[PDB]
Curated annotation (Swiss-Prot):
It catalyses: (1S,2R)-1-C-(indol-3-yl)glycerol 3-phosphate + L-serine = D-glyceraldehyde 3-phosphate + L-tryptophan + H2O. It comes from Legionella pneumophila subsp. pneumophila (strain Philadelphia 1 / ATCC 33152 / DSM 7513). The gene is trpA. The active site is at E50 (proton acceptor), E58 (proton acceptor). GO terms for cellular component: cytosol. PANTHER family: TRYPTOPHAN SYNTHASE ALPHA CHAIN, CHLOROPLASTIC, TRYPTOPHAN SYNTHASE, ALPHA CHAIN. The keyword Metal-binding does not apply. Its EC number is 4.2.1.20. This is Tryptophan synthase alpha chain. It is an enzyme of class 4 (lyase). NCBIfam families: trpA (TIGR00262).
């Protein structure tokens, strides 16, 4: 009874590699491109995919991405269908759905949980679900074997970390909301020492160089918006966003893997 996330994290650990996880919004810039983007990212070195559920509610880059997607009336079922299409040729790469609690609740907690797993979703990141309100979701998610990726920060309380260290599976999403790299490193390592699960840095990764500098000490890096910009700028410039996003992620994949060399 193993989740794709745990299997992937094990192979990474055995290969002495760090996780590289890209985020894109489902349906951005148009629906017919999402699955193609998912494959391209995996091809360019993505270990885990984060797929955003569009919702109107957070940085301006992600906000505009969700607005673009919502113009195509992209909803939960559409996101799940894209995962199914993806799973027709990719059954290995873990897929994480990222989004807000409201669309899932309107869909129905239990109905969404089983549909997500059936579609091939391995876990969720609920950005507006604090641990104090996650009891109900945690129980339903556990029934269908859906992982809950919890967030934590430099200020995450001791009681929260206790709750997180028990109910969280897979990995933790590290956030920290004029921050420089040395200060980040110190704060990250402090939090990592208090976490059972591996701690993935999920902000501020814009370039291959930065990705490599963070991966020096971090368990993994999450690309939060850099790929969104790369895709939409290539699209606006009448260029190919598949090549653009791939080239950016490949550059990060290579920079991360080149750690330890001379």
């Amino acid at each position: 009874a193993m989740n794709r996330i745990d299997k992937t994290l094990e192979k990474l650990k055995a290969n002495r590699k760090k996780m590289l996880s890209p985020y894109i919004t489902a349906g951005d810039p148009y629906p017919e491109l999402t699955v193609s983007l998912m494959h391209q990212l995996v091809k360019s070195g993505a270990d885990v995919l984060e797929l955003g559920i569009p919702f109107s509610d957070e940085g301006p880059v992600i906000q505009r991405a969700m607005e673009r997607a919502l113009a195509h009336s992209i909803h939960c079922d559409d996101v799940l269908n894209m995962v199914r299409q993806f799973r027709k040729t990719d059954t290995e790469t873990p897929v994480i759905l990222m989004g807000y609690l409201n669309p899932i609740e309107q869909y129905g907690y239990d109905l969404f949980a089983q549909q997500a797993v059936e579609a091939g979703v391995d876990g969720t990141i609920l950005v507006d679900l604090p641990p104090e309100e996650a009891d109900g979701v945690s129980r339903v998610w556990q029934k269908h074997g859906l992982y809950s990726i919890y967030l934590c920060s430099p200020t995450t309380s001791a009681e929260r970390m206790n709750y997180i260290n028990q109910h969280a599976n897979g990995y933790l999403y590290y956030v920290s909301l004029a921050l420089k790299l040395p200060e980040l490193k110190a704060q990250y390592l402090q939090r990592k020492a208090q976490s059972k699960l591996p701690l993935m840095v999920g902000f501020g990764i814009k370039t291959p160089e930065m990705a490599a500098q963070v991966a020096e000490f971090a368990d993994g890096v999450i690309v939060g918006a850099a790929l969104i910009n790369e895709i939409i700028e290539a699209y606006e410039a009448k260029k190919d966003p598949l090549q653009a996003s791939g080239a950016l992620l490949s550059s990060m994949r290579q920079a991360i893997d080149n750690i330890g060399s001379m």
